[PDB]
Amino acid sequence: KAHLEAQLKRALAEEIQALEDPRLFLLTVEAVRLSKDGSVLSVYVEAFREEEGALRALSRAERRLVAALARRVRMRRLPRLEFLPWRASPA
């Protein structure tokens, strides 16, 4: 039932920017994977240009981002979130 990775992909995409960093621009969500126990999520973020602030700032802003997911999805237990470099998949 860890396909609500689909709901997190939908909702986390919109919450993006929140993130306003001119050196990285728009932060895109390429994919989301959620563990079988619905406890952890991995967010494969997509961007045109890497910037330090939008890398590490995503991890600093994780608690706030989870709070926004909570509100958007109305889950009892929001998965812990980690951000992974977009792609680096060919595009």
Side-chain angles (χ1 to χ4, degrees), residues 1-16 28-35 38-45 65-66 68-70 72-75 77-83:
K1 299 295 179 295
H3 68 83
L4 199 163
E5 63 184 38
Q7 302 288 325
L8 276 70
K9 188 180 63 181
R10 295 181 178 181
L12 191 155
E14 69 184 51
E15 70 185 51
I16 300 316
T28 294
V29 297
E30 184 178 1
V32 168
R33 296 178 66 84
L34 190 155
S35 54
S39 174
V40 66
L41 196 106
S42 301
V43 58
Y44 297 97
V45 162
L65 293 176
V66 72
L69 283 174
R72 184 59 183 183
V73 68
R74 303 185 183 198
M75 288 174 186
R77 60 172 183 282
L78 279 75
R80 300 296 292 277
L81 182 62
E82 59 180 65
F83 291 87

Side-chain angles (χ1 to χ4, degrees), residues 16-35:
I16 300 316
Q17 314 180 292
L19 188 149
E20 292 295 325
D21 186 336
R23 304 189 176 270
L24 187 142
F25 295 30
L26 188 157
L27 183 153
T28 294
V29 297
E30 184 178 1
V32 168
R33 296 178 66 84
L34 190 155
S35 54

